[PDB]
Amino acid sequence: TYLNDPVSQAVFNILGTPDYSFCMDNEQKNWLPNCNLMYQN
């Protein structure tokens, strides 16, 4: 489900769009097989 108002939706997009590094290992070298996170890329 998503937020009720488009402006609050935009604010949540600005605040809570994780970096692509969160879908990779701590060495920032290889990707992960599964990642439900919607990173910026």
């Binding site: 990779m24 290992d25 701590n26 060495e27 070298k29 992960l32």
Partner: protein
Amino acid sequence: QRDLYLSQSKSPPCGGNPTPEMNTFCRTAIPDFISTVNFVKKQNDDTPKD
């Protein structure tokens, strides 16, 4: 350093998806370095028994 890593278990390096060698370092402890040096045993190993 290993105690710091242990107290940082949730976060990297011991957390997340560590590299296999980083995971190995995180798990295994370090032995005492002094006890690993023994001149008599080393010389006996080098010298043939005969």
